[PDB]
Design a protein around this ligand. Structure first.
Ligand SMILES: [Mg+2]
Ligand SMILES: [Mg+2]
Ligand SMILES: [Mg+2]
Ligand SMILES: [Mg+2]
Ligand SMILES: [Mg+2]
Ligand SMILES: [Mg+2]
Ligand SMILES: [Mg+2]
Ligand SMILES: [Mg+2]
Ligand SMILES: [Mg+2]
Ligand SMILES: [Mg+2]
Ligand SMILES: [Mg+2]
Ligand SMILES: [Mg+2]
Ligand SMILES: [Mg+2]
Ligand SMILES: [Mg+2]
Ligand SMILES: [Mg+2]
Ligand SMILES: [Mg+2]
Ligand SMILES: [Mg+2]
Ligand SMILES: [Mg+2]
Ligand SMILES: [Mg+2]
Ligand SMILES: [Mg+2]
Ligand SMILES: [Mg+2]
Ligand SMILES: [Mg+2]
Ligand SMILES: [Mg+2]
Ligand SMILES: [Mg+2]
Ligand SMILES: [Mg+2]
Ligand SMILES: [Mg+2]
Ligand SMILES: [Mg+2]
Ligand SMILES: [Mg+2]
Ligand SMILES: [Mg+2]
Ligand SMILES: [Mg+2]
Ligand SMILES: [Mg+2]
Ligand SMILES: [Mg+2]
Ligand SMILES: [Mg+2]
Ligand SMILES: [Mg+2]
Ligand SMILES: [Mg+2]
Ligand SMILES: [Mg+2]
Ligand SMILES: [Mg+2]
Ligand SMILES: [Mg+2]
Ligand SMILES: [Mg+2]
Ligand SMILES: [Mg+2]
Ligand SMILES: [Mg+2]
Ligand SMILES: [Mg+2]
Ligand SMILES: [Mg+2]
Ligand SMILES: [Mg+2]
Ligand SMILES: [Mg+2]
Ligand SMILES: [Mg+2]
Lengths: 55, 117, 103, 110, 142
RNA sequence: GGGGCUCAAACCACACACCGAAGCUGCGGGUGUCACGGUGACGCGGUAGAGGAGCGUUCUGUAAGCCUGUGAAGGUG
RNA sequence: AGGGGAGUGAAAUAGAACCUGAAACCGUAUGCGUACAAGCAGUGGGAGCCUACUUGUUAGGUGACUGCGUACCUUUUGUAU
């Protein structure tokens, strides 16, 4: 099955009105002021004021 | 003598696409669809110069009816009364007095009434 | 003070010092003309309804300019019958200014 | 001020890159740099390097302060595409286009 | 000297109250639709709503002639197969007395956005009283 | 056609009024044919098809001219 | 890779995929419209809003609401078909 008429410019842009991206929950560590994902270990290896992996 | 069509063909397509300004979708930006839209627009415009004169007489007549029945007379009885006495005033002028100069419209309706029509 | 006059097969409601465009007249620019076929003169609360033409009333005007209206385009198209025709039109007019209304 | 930075021929489709450009349009560069650092899209890694170039252009060539800047204009245009051949069943050959794009970022302190 | 046209921001509207106390349904409904549309004013234009407000109070005492009290039917379809439903004039008066007058007037109005706007100015009630005393409607004899 | 219509908004007679086309008249223009010496007159829907009159493109003569860096052709308002 | 400056040049939006750089097609910015409304998407009428200047018998952009209105070619006795 295939279209009998081609979609207009307006019609395909209405289908993409749900394609927008959402943002993530970012947090700041109180000790060092470093931004990280909420509930995740920071890129420097800290979580909840503690050193977990040290790279 | 070989003739190239590039310049003349482009000038002719741009005249059509300029008349198709403001139309929707492909009717304002591709020649094949815009050419038919311009022709049908000119077909409508020729016909609607006749219909403009019909739509405006119907509007004047409806407004004269509303103003005459406020003075105790119907449209058909007022037109017969006007023709009986003297008056040659247009429906266009009559509909203007019915809205703007209401004291003059009353005098005419009263004179048409006095012709026993 | 206003009047109803007939000119060019149409009727116009007219007030003093008014500019209006009527059908082309055979009058030179700047020349004065008068309108004897006056159908109605109304002076505030006084209205003279014209048995066909109001007796003694006359409306004067001066010719301001001659010109042509914007072009209209005529097309005659008969579909799938191999026929088409085009035409242009600009209609002449005379612009007059109403100088005085004699009741 | 309004200093720009451009990346011509980024190896990604324009439709995919415009989803990330809508996220940063009109924001301060500090809060738009953190958004791009934690995005899961590939177009966010490409566009984060262009934004950092525009910030570095403003500091060196214009003497701007990063803490007073914000991204004012961002758009994605189309680049030239490569054409390749993909074999299908029963001897049929299909044609592949590999699309690219041009990415422009402008920052402004005013 | 162009033709006068009404402007929706500068239209004068009145309030009227009409009693249906032994009036024929269709000859009362034609007077109502004429005034909802503004056909009684010299300012009437086909594309703006110049009409008045009509309040109808004794909606259950409207009448029909002949044998129409039991033989006049109202049909509607629900959109489901076999979903055609009917009710007669006698039973509809018992259940929804106001729907009788609204159905008659609505069919005498244009079927477009402007026609639905004129219909919004019709207030039909089944008592002898209405909730619109603050608007002070004037009496309209049929 | 719908709403709705019952001493009708049905039907049968009679009467008067009005609405209603690109028909007719009014006003302003353009054209064909014929007559007279610019006027009069009647014409001017159209497929196949016949007849008449034109626009624009490239090249040659006019041109060893004329235009053009104080801005040609082309593109876009 | 690609860019922002600086330089060369009469001119780099003449920067090497380099004279001019149209259209389809894809974007960003601004103005007006659009979430109770049914159909060849136009046209007759027409309010409101925005811009410009001659501050409204003006010019430009939008077009709420409303009357009419079933594409083009071919082939046919005849096509929205
Ligand atoms: Mg599919
Ligand atoms: Mg389809
Ligand atoms: Mg198809
Ligand atoms: Mg198909
Ligand atoms: Mg098909
Ligand atoms: Mg999608
Ligand atoms: Mg050729
Ligand atoms: Mg438009
Ligand atoms: Mg008519
Ligand atoms: Mg008419
Ligand atoms: Mg094989
Ligand atoms: Mg494809
Ligand atoms: Mg009908
Ligand atoms: Mg009788
Ligand atoms: Mg008659
Ligand atoms: Mg007519
Ligand atoms: Mg004729
Ligand atoms: Mg004539
Ligand atoms: Mg004829
Ligand atoms: Mg002919
Ligand atoms: Mg030559
Ligand atoms: Mg120049
Ligand atoms: Mg040449
Ligand atoms: Mg230099
Ligand atoms: Mg250039
Ligand atoms: Mg160049
Ligand atoms: Mg050169
Ligand atoms: Mg180039
Ligand atoms: Mg282009
Ligand atoms: Mg868009
Ligand atoms: Mg709305
Ligand atoms: Mg609703
Ligand atoms: Mg729809
Ligand atoms: Mg409908
Ligand atoms: Mg208009
Ligand atoms: Mg305007
Ligand atoms: Mg419109
Ligand atoms: Mg319309
Ligand atoms: Mg239709
Ligand atoms: Mg229709
Ligand atoms: Mg064909
Ligand atoms: Mg066949
Ligand atoms: Mg057949
Ligand atoms: Mg046969
Ligand atoms: Mg047909
Ligand atoms: Mg078809």
């Amino acid at each position: 099955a295939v279209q009998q008429n081609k979609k207009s410019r307006s019609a395909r842009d209405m289908r993409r009105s749900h394609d927008a991206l959402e943002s993530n929950a970012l947090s700041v560590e109180k000790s060092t002021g470093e931004v990280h994902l909420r509930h995740h270990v920071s890129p420097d290896g800290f979580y909840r004021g503690r050193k977990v992996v040290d790279k | 003598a070989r003739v190239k069509r590039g310049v003349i063909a482009r000038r002719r397509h741009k005249k059509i696409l300029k008349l198709a300004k403001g139309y929707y979708g492909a009717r304002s930006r591709v020649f094949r669809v815009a050419k038919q839209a311009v022709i049908k627009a000119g077909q409508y415009a020729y016909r609607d110069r006749r219909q403009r004169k019909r739509q405006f007489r119907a509007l004047w007549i409806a407004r004269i009816n509303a103003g005459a029945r406020q003075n105790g007379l119907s449209y058909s009885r007022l037109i017969a009364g006007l023709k009986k006495a003297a008056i040659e005033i247009d429906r266009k002028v009559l509909a203007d007095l019915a809205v703007n100069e209401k004291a003059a419209f009353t005098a005419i309706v009263e004179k048409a009434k006095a012709s026993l029509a | 003070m206003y009047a109803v006059i007939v000119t060019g097969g149409k009727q116009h409601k007219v007030t003093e010092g008014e500019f209006l465009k009527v059908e082309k007249l055979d009058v030179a620019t700047g020349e004065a003309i008068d309108f004897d076929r006056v159908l109605l003169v109304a002076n505030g609360e006084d209205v003279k309804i014209g048995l066909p033409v109001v007796e003694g009333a006359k409306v004067t005007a001066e010719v301001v300019s001659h010109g042509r209206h914007d072009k209209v385009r005529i097309i005659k198209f008969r579909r799938r019958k191999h026929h088409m025709k085009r035409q242009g039109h600009r209609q002449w007019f005379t612009e007059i200014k109403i100088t005085g209304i004699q009741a | 001020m309004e200093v720009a930075a451009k990346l011509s021929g980024a190896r990604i489709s324009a439709q995919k890159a415009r989803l990330v450009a809508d996220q940063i349009r009109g924001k301060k560069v500090g809060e738009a740099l953190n958004l791009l650092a934690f995005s899961s899209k590939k177009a966010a890694e490409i566009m984060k390097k262009v934004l950092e170039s525009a910030v570095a252009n403003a500091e060196h060539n214009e003497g701007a302060d990063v803490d007073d800047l914000k991204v004012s204009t961002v758009f994605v245009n189309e680049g030239r595409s490569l054409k390749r051949i993909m074999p299908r069943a029963k001897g049929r050959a299909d044609r592949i286009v590999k699309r690219s794009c041009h990415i422009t970022v402008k920052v402004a302190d005013k | 000297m162009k033709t006068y046209t009404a402007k929706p921001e500068t239209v004068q509207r009145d309030w009227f109250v009409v009693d249906a106390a032994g009036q024929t349904l269709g000859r009362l409904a034609t007077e109502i639709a004429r005034r909802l549309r503004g056909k009684h004013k010299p300012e009437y234009t086909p594309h703006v709503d110049t009409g008045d407000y009509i309040v109808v109070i004794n909606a259950e005492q409207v009448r029909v002639t002949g044998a129409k009290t039991t033989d006049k039917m109202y049909y509607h379809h629900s959109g489901f197969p076999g979903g055609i439903k009917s009710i007669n004039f006698e039973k509809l008066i018992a259940k929804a007395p106001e729907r009788v007058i609204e159905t008659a007037v609505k069919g005498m109005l244009p079927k477009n956005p402007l026609g639905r706007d004129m219909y919004r100015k019709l207030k039909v009630y089944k008592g002898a009283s209405h909730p619109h005393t603050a608007q002070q409607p004037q009496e309209l004899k049929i």
